Amino acid sequence: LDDVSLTHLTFGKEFTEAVEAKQVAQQEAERARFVVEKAEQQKKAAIISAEGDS
Amino acid sequence: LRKIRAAQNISKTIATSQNRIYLTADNLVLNLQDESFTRGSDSLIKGKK
């Protein structure tokens, strides 16, 4: 055997449902990521500003 | 100076207050009309010979 690969783990209805579900979860999770990052950035900016004023 | 910076920001928020009321529209009145007549001021009686 040259190669063995699993192709289309399904059913077909399942293709879409599964991908869709994961997609939504991913979007929300990543947005949460943005939130965390943004919070860190703001914290950082605050530190630097204080230093700068200093 | 971090204190100064913070003080500046806080002062900005506290001090600054403004109110604005704005309403505008383009008034472009275009009228096409004529002073026509639909009345009987007085009836003069005339005749042709």
Short mmCIF file of N, CA, C and O in Angstrom, two decimals:
data_model
loop_
_atom_site.label_atom_id
_atom_site.label_comp_id
_atom_site.label_asym_id
_atom_site.label_seq_id
_atom_site.Cartn_x
_atom_site.Cartn_y
_atom_site.Cartn_z
N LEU A 1 0.84 -1.16 0.00
CA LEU A 1 0.00 0.00 0.00
C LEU A 1 0.87 1.21 0.00
O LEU A 1 1.74 1.37 0.86
N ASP A 2 0.67 2.07 -1.01
CA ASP A 2 1.39 3.30 -1.15
C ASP A 2 0.91 4.26 -0.11
O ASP A 2 1.71 4.93 0.54
N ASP A 3 -0.42 4.37 0.06
CA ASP A 3 -0.93 5.31 1.01
C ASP A 3 -2.29 4.86 1.44
O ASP A 3 -3.02 4.24 0.67
N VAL A 4 -2.66 5.16 2.70
CA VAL A 4 -3.96 4.84 3.22
C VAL A 4 -4.45 6.07 3.92
O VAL A 4 -3.81 6.57 4.84
N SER A 5 -5.63 6.58 3.50
CA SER A 5 -6.10 7.78 4.14
C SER A 5 -7.58 7.67 4.33
O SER A 5 -8.30 7.12 3.50
N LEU A 6 -8.05 8.21 5.47
CA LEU A 6 -9.45 8.25 5.75
C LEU A 6 -9.99 9.39 4.95
O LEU A 6 -9.44 10.49 5.00
N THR A 7 -11.07 9.16 4.19
CA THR A 7 -11.64 10.27 3.48
C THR A 7 -13.11 10.32 3.77
O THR A 7 -13.77 9.29 3.91
N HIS A 8 -13.62 11.56 3.89
CA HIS A 8 -14.96 11.90 4.25
C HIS A 8 -15.46 11.10 5.41
O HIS A 8 -15.94 9.97 5.26
N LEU A 9 -15.28 11.66 6.63
CA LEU A 9 -15.86 11.12 7.82
C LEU A 9 -17.19 11.80 7.92
O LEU A 9 -17.26 13.02 8.00
N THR A 10 -18.28 11.01 7.92
CA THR A 10 -19.56 11.60 7.69
C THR A 10 -20.59 10.88 8.53
O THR A 10 -20.21 10.24 9.51
N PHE A 11 -21.91 10.90 8.19
CA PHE A 11 -22.68 11.23 7.00
C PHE A 11 -22.58 12.62 6.45
O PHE A 11 -21.96 13.52 7.02
N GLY A 12 -23.21 12.79 5.26
CA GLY A 12 -23.24 13.96 4.43
C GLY A 12 -23.96 15.07 5.11
O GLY A 12 -23.51 16.21 5.08
N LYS A 13 -25.12 14.77 5.74
CA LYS A 13 -25.81 15.78 6.49
C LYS A 13 -24.83 16.17 7.54
O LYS A 13 -24.71 17.33 7.93
N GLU A 14 -24.11 15.16 8.02
CA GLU A 14 -23.18 15.33 9.09
C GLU A 14 -22.03 16.17 8.66
O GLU A 14 -21.41 16.81 9.51
N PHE A 15 -21.67 16.18 7.35
CA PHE A 15 -20.53 16.97 6.96
C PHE A 15 -20.80 18.37 7.41
O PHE A 15 -20.04 18.97 8.17
N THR A 16 -21.93 18.91 6.92
CA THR A 16 -22.26 20.29 7.09
C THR A 16 -22.52 20.59 8.53
O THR A 16 -22.05 21.60 9.05
N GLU A 17 -23.28 19.72 9.23
CA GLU A 17 -23.64 20.04 10.58
C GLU A 17 -22.40 20.15 11.39
O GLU A 17 -22.23 21.08 12.17
N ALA A 18 -21.48 19.18 11.23
CA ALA A 18 -20.30 19.11 12.05
C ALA A 18 -19.44 20.31 11.82
O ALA A 18 -18.93 20.90 12.77
N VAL A 19 -19.23 20.68 10.55
CA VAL A 19 -18.34 21.76 10.25
C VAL A 19 -18.92 23.03 10.78
O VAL A 19 -18.21 23.87 11.34
N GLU A 20 -20.25 23.19 10.61
CA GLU A 20 -20.95 24.38 11.00
C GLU A 20 -20.82 24.56 12.48
O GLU A 20 -20.53 25.66 12.96
N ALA A 21 -21.04 23.48 13.24
CA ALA A 21 -21.03 23.58 14.67
C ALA A 21 -19.67 23.99 15.11
O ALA A 21 -19.52 24.86 15.97
N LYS A 22 -18.63 23.38 14.52
CA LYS A 22 -17.29 23.68 14.94
C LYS A 22 -16.99 25.11 14.61
O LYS A 22 -16.31 25.79 15.37
N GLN A 23 -17.49 25.58 13.46
CA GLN A 23 -17.21 26.91 12.99
C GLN A 23 -17.72 27.91 13.97
O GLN A 23 -17.01 28.85 14.34
N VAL A 24 -18.97 27.74 14.42
CA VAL A 24 -19.55 28.73 15.29
C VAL A 24 -18.77 28.76 16.56
O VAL A 24 -18.46 29.82 17.09
N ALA A 25 -18.43 27.57 17.08
CA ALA A 25 -17.72 27.48 18.32
C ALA A 25 -16.42 28.19 18.17
O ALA A 25 -15.98 28.91 19.06
N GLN A 26 -15.76 28.00 17.01
CA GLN A 26 -14.47 28.57 16.80
C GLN A 26 -14.57 30.06 16.78
O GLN A 26 -13.72 30.76 17.33
N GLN A 27 -15.62 30.61 16.13
CA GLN A 27 -15.71 32.03 16.00
C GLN A 27 -15.83 32.63 17.35
O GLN A 27 -15.16 33.62 17.66
N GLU A 28 -16.69 32.05 18.20
CA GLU A 28 -16.93 32.66 19.47
C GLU A 28 -15.69 32.56 20.30
O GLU A 28 -15.33 33.50 21.01
N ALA A 29 -15.00 31.40 20.23
CA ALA A 29 -13.84 31.20 21.04
C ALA A 29 -12.80 32.20 20.66
O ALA A 29 -12.14 32.78 21.52
N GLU A 30 -12.62 32.43 19.34
CA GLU A 30 -11.60 33.32 18.90
C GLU A 30 -11.94 34.72 19.29
O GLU A 30 -11.05 35.51 19.63
N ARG A 31 -13.23 35.09 19.26
CA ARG A 31 -13.60 36.42 19.64
C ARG A 31 -13.23 36.59 21.08
O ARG A 31 -12.80 37.66 21.49
N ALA A 32 -13.41 35.52 21.88
CA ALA A 32 -13.05 35.58 23.27
C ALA A 32 -11.58 35.87 23.32
O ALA A 32 -11.11 36.60 24.19
N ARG A 33 -10.83 35.28 22.37
CA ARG A 33 -9.41 35.47 22.29
C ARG A 33 -9.13 36.92 22.08
O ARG A 33 -8.22 37.49 22.68
N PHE A 34 -9.92 37.57 21.19
CA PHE A 34 -9.67 38.94 20.88
C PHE A 34 -9.84 39.72 22.13
O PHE A 34 -9.08 40.64 22.42
N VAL A 35 -10.87 39.36 22.92
CA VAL A 35 -11.18 40.08 24.11
C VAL A 35 -10.00 40.04 25.03
O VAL A 35 -9.59 41.06 25.58
N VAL A 36 -9.42 38.84 25.24
CA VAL A 36 -8.35 38.69 26.17
C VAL A 36 -7.19 39.51 25.71
O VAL A 36 -6.57 40.22 26.50
N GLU A 37 -6.86 39.42 24.41
CA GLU A 37 -5.71 40.09 23.88
C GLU A 37 -5.89 41.57 24.05
O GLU A 37 -4.97 42.27 24.47
N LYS A 38 -7.10 42.07 23.73
CA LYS A 38 -7.34 43.48 23.77
C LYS A 38 -7.19 43.97 25.17
O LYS A 38 -6.67 45.06 25.39
N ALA A 39 -7.62 43.17 26.16
CA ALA A 39 -7.52 43.56 27.53
C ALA A 39 -6.07 43.69 27.88
O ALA A 39 -5.68 44.62 28.58
N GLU A 40 -5.24 42.75 27.41
CA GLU A 40 -3.85 42.78 27.73
C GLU A 40 -3.23 44.00 27.12
O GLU A 40 -2.40 44.66 27.74
N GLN A 41 -3.63 44.33 25.88
CA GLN A 41 -3.02 45.44 25.21
C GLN A 41 -3.34 46.69 25.96
O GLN A 41 -2.48 47.55 26.13
N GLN A 42 -4.59 46.82 26.44
CA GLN A 42 -4.96 48.03 27.11
C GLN A 42 -4.20 48.13 28.39
O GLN A 42 -3.78 49.22 28.79
N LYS A 43 -3.98 47.00 29.08
CA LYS A 43 -3.24 47.01 30.31
C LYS A 43 -1.85 47.48 30.02
O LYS A 43 -1.29 48.27 30.77
N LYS A 44 -1.26 46.98 28.92
CA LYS A 44 0.08 47.30 28.52
C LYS A 44 0.15 48.77 28.25
O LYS A 44 1.07 49.45 28.70
N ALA A 45 -0.83 49.30 27.50
CA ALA A 45 -0.79 50.68 27.12
C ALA A 45 -0.80 51.51 28.36
O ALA A 45 -0.10 52.52 28.44
N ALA A 46 -1.59 51.10 29.37
CA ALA A 46 -1.72 51.84 30.59
C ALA A 46 -0.38 51.91 31.27
O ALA A 46 0.00 52.95 31.79
N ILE A 47 0.36 50.78 31.28
CA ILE A 47 1.64 50.72 31.95
C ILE A 47 2.58 51.68 31.28
O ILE A 47 3.23 52.48 31.94
N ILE A 48 2.66 51.61 29.94
CA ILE A 48 3.60 52.41 29.19
C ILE A 48 3.29 53.86 29.35
O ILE A 48 4.19 54.68 29.44
N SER A 49 1.99 54.21 29.36
CA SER A 49 1.60 55.58 29.49
C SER A 49 2.08 56.10 30.81
O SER A 49 2.63 57.20 30.90
N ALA A 50 1.90 55.31 31.89
CA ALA A 50 2.28 55.73 33.21
C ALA A 50 3.76 55.93 33.25
O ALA A 50 4.25 56.86 33.88
N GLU A 51 4.52 55.04 32.58
CA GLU A 51 5.95 55.11 32.54
C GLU A 51 6.29 56.39 31.85
O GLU A 51 7.20 57.11 32.27
N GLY A 52 5.59 56.65 30.74
CA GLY A 52 5.90 57.77 29.90
C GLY A 52 5.67 59.02 30.66
O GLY A 52 6.47 59.95 30.60
N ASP A 53 4.55 59.09 31.40
CA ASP A 53 4.28 60.31 32.09
C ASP A 53 5.37 60.48 33.09
O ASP A 53 5.95 61.56 33.19
N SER A 54 5.71 59.39 33.80
CA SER A 54 6.77 59.34 34.77
C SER A 54 7.97 60.04 34.25
O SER A 54 8.45 61.01 34.84
N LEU B 1 4.77 60.87 37.62
CA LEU B 1 4.04 61.33 36.49
C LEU B 1 2.98 60.40 36.01
O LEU B 1 2.09 60.84 35.29
N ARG B 2 3.01 59.12 36.39
CA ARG B 2 1.89 58.30 36.05
C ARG B 2 0.67 58.91 36.69
O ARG B 2 -0.42 58.87 36.12
N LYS B 3 0.83 59.47 37.90
CA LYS B 3 -0.27 60.07 38.60
C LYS B 3 -0.75 61.25 37.81
O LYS B 3 -1.95 61.49 37.73
N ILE B 4 0.18 62.02 37.21
CA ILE B 4 -0.20 63.18 36.45
C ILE B 4 -0.96 62.74 35.24
O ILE B 4 -1.96 63.36 34.88
N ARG B 5 -0.51 61.67 34.57
CA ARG B 5 -1.16 61.23 33.38
C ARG B 5 -2.57 60.83 33.71
O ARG B 5 -3.51 61.19 33.01
N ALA B 6 -2.74 60.06 34.80
CA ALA B 6 -4.04 59.57 35.18
C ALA B 6 -4.91 60.73 35.52
O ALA B 6 -6.10 60.74 35.21
N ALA B 7 -4.33 61.74 36.19
CA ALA B 7 -5.06 62.90 36.60
C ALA B 7 -5.53 63.61 35.37
O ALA B 7 -6.64 64.13 35.34
N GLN B 8 -4.69 63.65 34.32
CA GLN B 8 -5.06 64.34 33.12
C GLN B 8 -6.24 63.66 32.50
O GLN B 8 -7.19 64.32 32.08
N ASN B 9 -6.22 62.32 32.43
CA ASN B 9 -7.27 61.59 31.78
C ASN B 9 -8.54 61.78 32.54
O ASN B 9 -9.61 61.98 31.95
N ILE B 10 -8.46 61.72 33.88
CA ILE B 10 -9.63 61.81 34.69
C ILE B 10 -10.20 63.19 34.55
O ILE B 10 -11.41 63.37 34.48
N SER B 11 -9.33 64.23 34.49
CA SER B 11 -9.78 65.59 34.39
C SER B 11 -10.44 65.78 33.06
O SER B 11 -11.39 66.55 32.94
N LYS B 12 -9.93 65.09 32.02
CA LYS B 12 -10.51 65.26 30.72
C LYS B 12 -11.91 64.74 30.76
O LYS B 12 -12.84 65.40 30.29
N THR B 13 -12.11 63.54 31.34
CA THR B 13 -13.42 62.97 31.35
C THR B 13 -14.32 63.83 32.17
O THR B 13 -15.44 64.14 31.77
N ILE B 14 -13.85 64.24 33.36
CA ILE B 14 -14.71 64.95 34.27
C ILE B 14 -15.08 66.28 33.71
O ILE B 14 -16.26 66.63 33.63
N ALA B 15 -14.07 67.06 33.30
CA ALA B 15 -14.30 68.41 32.92
C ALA B 15 -15.12 68.48 31.67
O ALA B 15 -16.03 69.30 31.57
N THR B 16 -14.82 67.62 30.68
CA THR B 16 -15.39 67.84 29.39
C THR B 16 -16.80 67.39 29.35
O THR B 16 -17.12 66.23 29.58
N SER B 17 -17.68 68.35 29.04
CA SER B 17 -19.06 68.05 28.83
C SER B 17 -19.55 69.08 27.88
O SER B 17 -19.31 70.28 28.06
N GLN B 18 -20.25 68.64 26.83
CA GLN B 18 -20.81 69.55 25.89
C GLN B 18 -22.11 68.96 25.48
O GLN B 18 -22.34 67.76 25.68
N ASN B 19 -23.01 69.78 24.93
CA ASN B 19 -24.24 69.23 24.44
C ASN B 19 -24.42 69.81 23.09
O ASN B 19 -24.10 70.98 22.85
N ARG B 20 -24.93 69.01 22.14
CA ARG B 20 -25.12 69.55 20.83
C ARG B 20 -26.43 69.08 20.31
O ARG B 20 -26.76 67.89 20.39
N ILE B 21 -27.21 70.02 19.74
CA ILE B 21 -28.46 69.67 19.15
C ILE B 21 -28.34 70.10 17.73
O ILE B 21 -28.13 71.28 17.45
N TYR B 22 -28.45 69.16 16.78
CA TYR B 22 -28.31 69.57 15.42
C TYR B 22 -29.43 69.05 14.61
O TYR B 22 -29.79 67.87 14.71
N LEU B 23 -30.02 69.92 13.78
CA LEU B 23 -31.06 69.53 12.87
C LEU B 23 -30.84 70.33 11.63
O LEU B 23 -30.75 71.55 11.68
N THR B 24 -30.73 69.65 10.47
CA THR B 24 -30.53 70.40 9.27
C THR B 24 -31.24 69.69 8.17
O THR B 24 -31.48 68.48 8.24
N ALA B 25 -31.60 70.44 7.11
CA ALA B 25 -32.22 69.84 5.97
C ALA B 25 -31.97 70.75 4.82
O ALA B 25 -31.77 71.95 5.00
N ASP B 26 -31.97 70.21 3.60
CA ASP B 26 -31.77 71.06 2.47
C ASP B 26 -33.12 71.49 2.01
O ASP B 26 -33.87 70.71 1.43
N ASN B 27 -33.47 72.77 2.26
CA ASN B 27 -34.75 73.23 1.82
C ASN B 27 -34.58 73.73 0.43
O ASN B 27 -33.99 74.79 0.20
N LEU B 28 -35.09 72.97 -0.55
CA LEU B 28 -35.03 73.40 -1.91
C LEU B 28 -36.44 73.38 -2.39
O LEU B 28 -36.99 72.32 -2.68
N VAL B 29 -37.08 74.56 -2.48
CA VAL B 29 -38.45 74.57 -2.90
C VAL B 29 -38.48 74.88 -4.35
O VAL B 29 -37.96 75.91 -4.79
N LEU B 30 -39.09 73.98 -5.14
CA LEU B 30 -39.23 74.20 -6.54
C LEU B 30 -40.70 74.17 -6.80
O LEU B 30 -41.37 73.19 -6.49
N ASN B 31 -41.24 75.26 -7.38
CA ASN B 31 -42.64 75.29 -7.63
C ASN B 31 -42.84 75.63 -9.07
O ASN B 31 -42.21 76.56 -9.59
N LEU B 32 -43.71 74.88 -9.75
CA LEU B 32 -44.06 75.21 -11.09
C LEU B 32 -45.54 75.37 -11.08
O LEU B 32 -46.28 74.41 -10.85
N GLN B 33 -46.03 76.60 -11.31
CA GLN B 33 -47.45 76.78 -11.24
C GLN B 33 -47.75 78.04 -11.98
O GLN B 33 -46.84 78.76 -12.40
N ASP B 34 -49.05 78.32 -12.19
CA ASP B 34 -49.41 79.52 -12.90
C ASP B 34 -50.60 80.09 -12.21
O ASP B 34 -51.40 79.35 -11.63
N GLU B 35 -50.74 81.43 -12.24
CA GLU B 35 -51.89 82.04 -11.64
C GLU B 35 -52.99 82.02 -12.65
O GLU B 35 -53.15 82.95 -13.44
N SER B 36 -53.79 80.93 -12.66
CA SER B 36 -54.85 80.78 -13.61
C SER B 36 -56.09 81.32 -12.99
O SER B 36 -56.08 81.76 -11.84
N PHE B 37 -57.21 81.32 -13.73
CA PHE B 37 -58.40 81.89 -13.17
C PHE B 37 -59.46 80.85 -13.10
O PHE B 37 -59.65 80.08 -14.04
N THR B 38 -60.17 80.80 -11.96
CA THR B 38 -61.33 79.99 -11.87
C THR B 38 -62.29 80.76 -11.03
O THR B 38 -62.65 80.34 -9.92
N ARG B 39 -62.74 81.92 -11.53
CA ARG B 39 -63.60 82.74 -10.73
C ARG B 39 -64.38 83.63 -11.62
O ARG B 39 -64.10 83.75 -12.81
N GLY B 40 -65.41 84.29 -11.04
CA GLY B 40 -66.18 85.24 -11.78
C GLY B 40 -66.14 86.51 -10.99
O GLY B 40 -66.93 86.72 -10.08
N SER B 41 -65.20 87.40 -11.35
CA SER B 41 -65.09 88.64 -10.64
C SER B 41 -66.38 89.37 -10.83
O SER B 41 -67.17 89.51 -9.89
N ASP B 42 -66.63 89.86 -12.05
CA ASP B 42 -67.86 90.53 -12.33
C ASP B 42 -68.19 90.19 -13.75
O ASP B 42 -67.29 90.03 -14.58
N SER B 43 -69.49 90.06 -14.05
CA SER B 43 -69.82 89.70 -15.40
C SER B 43 -70.23 90.96 -16.10
O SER B 43 -71.19 91.62 -15.70
N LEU B 44 -69.51 91.30 -17.17
CA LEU B 44 -69.87 92.43 -17.96
C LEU B 44 -70.60 91.88 -19.13
O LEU B 44 -70.21 90.86 -19.70
N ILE B 45 -71.71 92.54 -19.53
CA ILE B 45 -72.45 92.00 -20.63
C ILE B 45 -72.10 92.81 -21.83
O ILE B 45 -72.20 94.04 -21.83
N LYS B 46 -71.66 92.12 -22.89
CA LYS B 46 -71.28 92.77 -24.10
C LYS B 46 -71.94 92.03 -25.21
O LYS B 46 -72.47 90.94 -25.02
N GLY B 47 -71.95 92.64 -26.41
CA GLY B 47 -72.56 91.99 -27.53
C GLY B 47 -71.76 92.35 -28.73
O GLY B 47 -71.02 93.33 -28.72
N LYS B 48 -71.88 91.55 -29.81
CA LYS B 48 -71.14 91.84 -30.99
C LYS B 48 -72.12 92.16 -32.06
O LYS B 48 -73.16 91.51 -32.18
N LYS B 49 -71.82 93.19 -32.87
CA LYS B 49 -72.70 93.54 -33.94
C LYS B 49 -71.91 93.37 -35.23
O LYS B 49 -72.48 93.66 -36.32
#
